[PDB]
Amino acid sequence: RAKWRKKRMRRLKRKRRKMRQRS
Amino acid sequence: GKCRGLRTARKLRSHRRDQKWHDKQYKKAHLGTALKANPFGGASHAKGIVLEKVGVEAKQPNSAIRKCVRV
Amino acid sequence: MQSNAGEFVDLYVPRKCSASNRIIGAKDHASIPMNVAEVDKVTGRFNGQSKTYAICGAIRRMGESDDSILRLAKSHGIVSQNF
Amino acid sequence: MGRVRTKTVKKAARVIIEKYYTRLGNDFHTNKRVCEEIAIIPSKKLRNKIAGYVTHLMKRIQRGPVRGISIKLQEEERERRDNYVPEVSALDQEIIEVDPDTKEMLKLLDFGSLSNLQVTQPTVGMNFK
Amino acid sequence: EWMPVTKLGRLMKDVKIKSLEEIYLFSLPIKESEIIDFFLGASLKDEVLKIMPVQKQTRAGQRTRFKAFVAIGDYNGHVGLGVKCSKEVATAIRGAIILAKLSIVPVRRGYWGNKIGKPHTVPCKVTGRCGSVLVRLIPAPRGTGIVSAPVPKKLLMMAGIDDCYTSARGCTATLGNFAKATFDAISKTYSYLTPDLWKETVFTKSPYQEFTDHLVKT
Amino acid sequence: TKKRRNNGRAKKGRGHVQPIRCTNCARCVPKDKAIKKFVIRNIVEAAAVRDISEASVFDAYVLPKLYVKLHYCVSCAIHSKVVRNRSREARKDRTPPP
Amino acid sequence: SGALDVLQMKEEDVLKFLAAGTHLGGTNLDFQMEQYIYKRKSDGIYIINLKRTWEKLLLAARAIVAIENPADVSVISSRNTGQRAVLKFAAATGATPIAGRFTPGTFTNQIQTAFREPRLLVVTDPRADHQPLTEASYVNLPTIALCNTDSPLRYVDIAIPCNNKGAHSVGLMWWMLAREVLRMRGTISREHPWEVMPDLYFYRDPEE
Amino acid sequence: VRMNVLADALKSINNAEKRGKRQVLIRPCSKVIVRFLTVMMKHGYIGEFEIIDDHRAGKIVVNLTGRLNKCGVISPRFDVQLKDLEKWQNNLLPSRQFGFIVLTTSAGIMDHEEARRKHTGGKILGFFF
Amino acid sequence: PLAKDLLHPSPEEEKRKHKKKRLVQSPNSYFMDVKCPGCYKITTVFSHAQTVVLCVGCSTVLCQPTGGKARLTEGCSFRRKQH
RNA sequence: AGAUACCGUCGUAGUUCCGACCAUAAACGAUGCCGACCGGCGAUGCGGCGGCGUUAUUCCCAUGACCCGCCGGGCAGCUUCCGGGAAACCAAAGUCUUUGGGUUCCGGGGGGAGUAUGGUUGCAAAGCUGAAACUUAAAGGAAUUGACGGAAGGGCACCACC
Numbered sequence A: 001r002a003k004w005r006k007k008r009m010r011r012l013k014r015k016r017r018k019m020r021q022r023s
Numbered sequence B: 001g002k003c004r005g006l007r008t009a010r011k012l013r014s015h016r017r018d019q020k021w022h023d024k025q026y027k028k029a030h031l032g033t034a035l036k037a038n039p040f041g042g043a044s045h046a047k048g049i050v051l052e053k054v055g056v057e058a059k060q061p062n063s064a065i066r067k068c069v070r071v
Numbered sequence C: 001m002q003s004n005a006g007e008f009v010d011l012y013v014p015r016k017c018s019a020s021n022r023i024i025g026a027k028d029h030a031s032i033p034m035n036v037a038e039v040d041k042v043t044g045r046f047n048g049q050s051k052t053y054a055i056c057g058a059i060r061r062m063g064e065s066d067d068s069i070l071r072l073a074k075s076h077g078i079v080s081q082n083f
Numbered sequence D: 001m002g003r004v005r006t007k008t009v010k011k012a013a014r015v016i017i018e019k020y021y022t023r024l025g026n027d028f029h030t031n032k033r034v035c036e037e038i039a040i041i042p043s044k045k046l047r048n049k050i051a052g053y054v055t056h057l058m059k060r061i062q063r064g065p066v067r068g069i070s071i072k073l074q075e076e077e078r079e080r081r082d083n084y085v086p087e088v089s090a091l092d093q094e095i096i097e098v099d100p101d102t103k104e105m106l107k108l109l110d111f112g113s114l115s116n117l118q119v120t121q122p123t124v125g126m127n128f129k
Numbered sequence E: 001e002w003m004p005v006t007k008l009g010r011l012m013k014d015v016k017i018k019s020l021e022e023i024y025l026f027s028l029p030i031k032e033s034e035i036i037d038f039f040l041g042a043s044l045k046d047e048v049l050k051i052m053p054v055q056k057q058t059r060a061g062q063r064t065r066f067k068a069f070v071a072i073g074d075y076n077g078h079v080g081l082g083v084k085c086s087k088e089v090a091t092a093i094r095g096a097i098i099l100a101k102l103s104i105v106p107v108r109r110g111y112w113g114n115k116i117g118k119p120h121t122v123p124c125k126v127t128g129r130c131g132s133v134l135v136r137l138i139p140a141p142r143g144t145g146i147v148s149a150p151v152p153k154k155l156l157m158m159a160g161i162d163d164c165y166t167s168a169r170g171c172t173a174t175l176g177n178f179a180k181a182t183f184d185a186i187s188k189t190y191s192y193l194t195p196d197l198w199k200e201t202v203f204t205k206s207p208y209q210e211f212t213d214h215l216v217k218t
Numbered sequence F: 001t002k003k004r005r006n007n008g009r010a011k012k013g014r015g016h017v018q019p020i021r022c023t024n025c026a027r028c029v030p031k032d033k034a035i036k037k038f039v040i041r042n043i044v045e046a047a048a049v050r051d052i053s054e055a056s057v058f059d060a061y062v063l064p065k066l067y068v069k070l071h072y073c074v075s076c077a078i079h080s081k082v083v084r085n086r087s088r089e090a091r092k093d094r095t096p097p098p
Numbered sequence G: 001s002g003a004l005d006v007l008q009m010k011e012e013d014v015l016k017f018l019a020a021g022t023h024l025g026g027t028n029l030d031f032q033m034e035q036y037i038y039k040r041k042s043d044g045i046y047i048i049n050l051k052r053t054w055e056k057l058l059l060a061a062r063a064i065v066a067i068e069n070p071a072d073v074s075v076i077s078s079r080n081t082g083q084r085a086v087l088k089f090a091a092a093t094g095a096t097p098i099a100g101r102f103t104p105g106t107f108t109n110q111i112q113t114a115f116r117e118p119r120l121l122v123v124t125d126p127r128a129d130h131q132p133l134t135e136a137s138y139v140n141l142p143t144i145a146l147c148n149t150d151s152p153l154r155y156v157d158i159a160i161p162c163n164n165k166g167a168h169s170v171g172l173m174w175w176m177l178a179r180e181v182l183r184m185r186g187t188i189s190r191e192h193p194w195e196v197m198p199d200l201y202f203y204r205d206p207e208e
Numbered sequence H: 001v002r003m004n005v006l007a008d009a010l011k012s013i014n015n016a017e018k019r020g021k022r023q024v025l026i027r028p029c030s031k032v033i034v035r036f037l038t039v040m041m042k043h044g045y046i047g048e049f050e051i052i053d054d055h056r057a058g059k060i061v062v063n064l065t066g067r068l069n070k071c072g073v074i075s076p077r078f079d080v081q082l083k084d085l086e087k088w089q090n091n092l093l094p095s096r097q098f099g100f101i102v103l104t105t106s107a108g109i110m111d112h113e114e115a116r117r118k119h120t121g122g123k124i125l126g127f128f129f
Numbered sequence I: 001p002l003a004k005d006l007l008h009p010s011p012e013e014e015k016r017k018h019k020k021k022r023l024v025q026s027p028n029s030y031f032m033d034v035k036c037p038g039c040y041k042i043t044t045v046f047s048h049a050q051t052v053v054l055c056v057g058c059s060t061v062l063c064q065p066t067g068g069k070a071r072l073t074e075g076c077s078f079r080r081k082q083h
Numbered sequence J: 001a002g003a004u005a006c007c008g009u010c011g012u013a014g015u016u017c018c019g020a021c022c023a024u025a026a027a028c029g030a031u032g033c034c035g036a037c038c039g040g041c042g043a044u045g046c047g048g049c050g051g052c053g054u055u056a057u058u059c060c061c062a063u064g065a066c067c068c069g070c071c072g073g074g075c076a077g078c079u080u081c082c083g084g085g086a087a088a089c090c091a092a093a094g095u096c097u098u099u100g101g102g103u104u105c106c107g108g109g110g111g112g113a114g115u116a117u118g119g120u121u122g123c124a125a126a127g128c129u130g131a132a133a134c135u136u137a138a139a140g141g142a143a144u145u146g147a148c149g150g151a152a153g154g155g156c157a158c159c160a161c162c
């Protein structure tokens, strides 16, 4: 679905920001 | 829906100098990153040795094994 | 509309409306020629002659066919009586 | 107990009563024999189904002329009813109502005809919203 | 042969109206096709623009009806364009011609801008459109030939229009539209109030008046 | 596309109208879109009216009506069969049914 | 419209009109129809200029008489009020009347159970005698309609502003119109009453 | 608001000619507009018009005639160096045989054929045909 | 074709248009006189008043501005449109 | 079957209030602003105007409430081939090859993507600005015929039931 896709990709970014705390 | 004025020649001009970039037939041919990723240096041809000989299949509608080379 | 010698090389001269001077086309079908008889104005009997009119197919669709026959008839001395 | 007689029977019967309306009657048995004489009916059964509609259709015509057939003895009845002529009643013999502004149209026409005057200008009721 | 069902056909079979002019002035409908063939059987050269098969779905085998585009012309001042559909390409191609003859309309040929010799082009910039196809006709000098796609290069030619520039709108692939438009434009020559015109016309007793004395015959 | 020029709403020239809960499933529809009904009914419906006349103390009694204003959500409405789909030309007319 | 004792408006004719209420129209005015409405009284119904009716009813007469052959004009009525009248008009003139339901396509569709090509339509009512007003576009047909104060004036050449709801009003003018189209061709000296009364053209159920 | 007061007047008659009216009124007036319509009237494209006067602006009434096909306006007011004039009257006109384009000029407002004889140029106003 | 004169319309159609949309615009008001109840010093007063007026000949109010037209306290002689 | 779902009894955050952040929604009329013109009609809101009767008062009178119309500016409606459009539809989505009233923003086949990075605002959630490599011959809008519906409306059949 169009929106739930936008939730995954918004969730997925927070993974990417969080693994710059590690460096 | 237009400028169409008589002292507006700059706005009709700095608009088209801006909206040309969305013509992918022009963005490719005028941006340095498009030619850079070309394995040719923009050349017509390019020599090079053969380092193996491999075959590759065909898409779904019709089957075959097209022959190729890893130059 | 002419020639080198001035001859009128043309198939015909199409009829023209009597309220808008528009050209009734060769394949229009709502456009009509109409005839209004005369009377000798001494006995009322049909005096032979005819009054010709035309209306383009656009007018009749707009409903102004009669309002244009009327104004043409008042000007040409067919109806002269006022309100 | 009975069926819809298809367009074969309905069309065949309506012409018979339209062509021999005087030689027909009320009773089926009379009509069965008549139809055979005046029509070449291919089948015994349908002749008794055509004669069935004819006697049913005559029971119709004696009860107010209907919209199917043309009967000369019934048509001449209409023309006497459509050409009737009494002494004129369209003329509206003397004084006949005219509304107050109607005579003003007439006096603008310059007619001195005689008629009635009412008063109606006070408006008290008209169309509904 | 040909006994008519129209007053015009009654008046036409007997030689009493001579040309399509007198039929076109009063814009009388053409209800039979034999009328034109009596006037214009010679040089009415047939052609087949396309035969497009169209298919309508059904619970049973998907049905197929063919379409026939036929234009008719004379290179002297008339053009037609007929269409038809039927379940056999022999009758569709036969029926298209008859419907093409009925739709025959007169075309006016003018000069580029120098006024010596025979007319050779469209009088002025005419246009038309059906289904977004917009065929413009732009006057051209003598002796250039027609410039257009092969489809309307024919419609214009059958008119005798020797030299006509043109310019077309997008989506011309469908001959049902691109031919219809270029036919619509050439009909639109006798629809301009040109300054060459404006001479008052005198209505001249449409054939039904002058020829009613015989036309009450039975 | 556009099935209805009204979008199904009765809102023209304003912002948003207050939403009224459905009077079956409690779905929150705005007061415009909802299908409103106003049913007046005797409390003593006809299957028993005369059986009450026999047992009535008073000589003249009228058995007062009952007044409830029902609002239906679109989904709760079609299913209960108040309304139905209609043909794209008969869709236009808005006069209440006879 | 004219300068005659027999062409201009006569007291005898005006008494006919006011008798059958031709002057009362309806409650609505169509913007093409303003030029034939005198005033509106206070109950809300329109009064027609009976003189203006005369010009048009004389103009329409001058249209019909110009037609060379009487059969060439098809007079058409599709309301039960004037069905009998239009039969009478063809009887006293020589027209080809059309009463009853208008078979759609009697002027088109060559291969027709009923087919005519006339040169002039005469329709009782522009609203309910609908189709011939529209089939008078696919072939070149002039039109003559007894237009009310509410009827559309589309596809009509001559508009006779009159009341046409009542039976008396329509029956009158078919007798009236027939009288004018006949006279200009010759039946009497024009200095006589025409020996047929309007009641012949009036609507009437069997009532003894 | 109103900017090109020539443009609005021409669209007011063009929309009124399309319908088929005989007379049309335009709201503002100017020498630029009066000297405009006179160019048409000097060719017979329109009838004979009147110029209502006020203290405020003036409002022209025109007696239209069924002879003009379209009466456009061209803005902004360009230039015509008499070498571009043949380009303009080929991408803005129906044909060379008829139709004229009017362009203002140091010797008054005049249609292009006047410009060729007086051998001058100047800014452009509009066109008709 | 709805061809009607915009130059010479009836003096009664001109009241069927706005104050501005007429042929030549003119105000809908009219200057009126008033006889100042109880005294004979006759003063001018504008029909569409937006201010009261007080009379030394009355010591009571004369015109009362309500809406877009005045209402006079007591009837008086009212000349009009001498302008 | 699974049901960490629909269903039902509980129940934290939350819902409401005062003081600050956030600046996003199919925030929709999916339809920029201002200005002009081209059809009718019956009503609706507000203002002023002309009106004959009634009703509130004992008095036109001040004024309401009804009843008939006009004018301006609104929310909207019905109808028409003015005219547009791919068409559904539109008095604007009209005045558009017969193109030019003035002006702002913005789109160039679909996907990768509103992703990576860089700048910037934010307490956080996030918002604004925002690519390419590569991949693909079609993605996509409106109508037309069928098929299909655990979609409604009629009706028939013991290869259907009662």
Ligand SMILES: [Zn+2]
Residues within 6 Å of the ligand: F022, F023, F024, F025, F026, F027, F072, F073, F075, F076, F077
């Ligand atoms: Zn619900």
